[PDB]
């Protein structure tokens, strides 16, 4: 595995170069949104984002070393977590709003257009404000995104390799903090702060998944094959 041989700076480089592009939402949507029209716009975006996510995963060091069955499993378990953290990252510089796409910046009020959605929007906004306060950097963000992919479904030959890569990502994060001039104590504290956020992201994903299976039965969500399969995986 060339992954286990990468240095910290090479790890950061590989992850930064693997970043997916930012996609646009269907243009000139009719406002205000109806429950069905908003979900239509968001599900359309998510479906296209999933295609890019699958290809981003293949570029995450070590992921290629896993079996197709495992790769499928990790993505099925982590896709929504990955969509959410990307959203929280794009929204950092926009207090109070969620930047779903450059041409689609929504406020919590618009989240009331869909039953049960405002609760999820609020958690997402709190996470974004948390990253803002922490002044989360781009190199740290890509590290966290890769940890989500490898850790979310990890729970022996395959497991050991995954744990080794996770350990390398940890080393990378500490490396970045050391360069930022943080003391040893501050490095450990920030590392803990960042990893504990992943607990909240897992929570939002579990809640989002339940709410998604809720909109589904109400025939409010469009029939986007990939998105539906990913949802059925749960």
């Amino acid at each position: 595995s060339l992954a286990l041989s990468l240095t910290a700076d090479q790890m950061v480089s590989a992850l930064l170069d693997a970043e997916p592009p930012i996609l646009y939402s269907e243009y000139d949507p009719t406002r205000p949104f109806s429950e069905a029209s908003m979900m239509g716009l968001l599900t359309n975006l998510a479906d296209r984002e999933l295609v890019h996510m699958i290809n981003w995963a293949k570029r995450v060091p070590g992921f290629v070393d896993l079996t197709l069955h495992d790769q499928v499993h990790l993505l099925e378990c982590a896709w929504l977590e990955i969509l959410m953290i990307g959203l929280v990252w794009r929204s950092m510089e926009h207090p109070g709003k969620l930047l779903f796409a450059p041409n689609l910046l929504l406020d919590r009020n618009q989240g009331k257009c869909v039953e049960g959605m405002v609760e999820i929007f609020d958690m997402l906004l709190a996470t974004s404000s948390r990253f803002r306060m922490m002044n989360l950097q781009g190199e740290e963000f890509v590290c966290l995104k890769s940890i989500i992919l490898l850790n979310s479904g990890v729970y022996l030959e395959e497991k050991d390799h995954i744990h080794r890569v996770l350990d390398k990502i940890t080393d990378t994060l500490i490396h970045l903090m050391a360069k930022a001039g943080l003391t040893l104590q501050q490095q450990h504290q920030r590392l803990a702060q960042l990893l504990l956020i992943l607990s909240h992201i897992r929570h939002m994903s579990n809640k989002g998944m339940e709410h998604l299976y809720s909109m589904k039965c109400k025939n409010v969500v469009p029939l986007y094959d990939l998105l539906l399969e990913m949802l059925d995986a749960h």
Binding site: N55, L68, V72, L75, E76
Partner: peptide, 10 residues
Amino acid sequence: HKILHRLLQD
């Protein structure tokens, strides 16, 4: 796990 399978193979 159909489409995802194929996309991961391509």
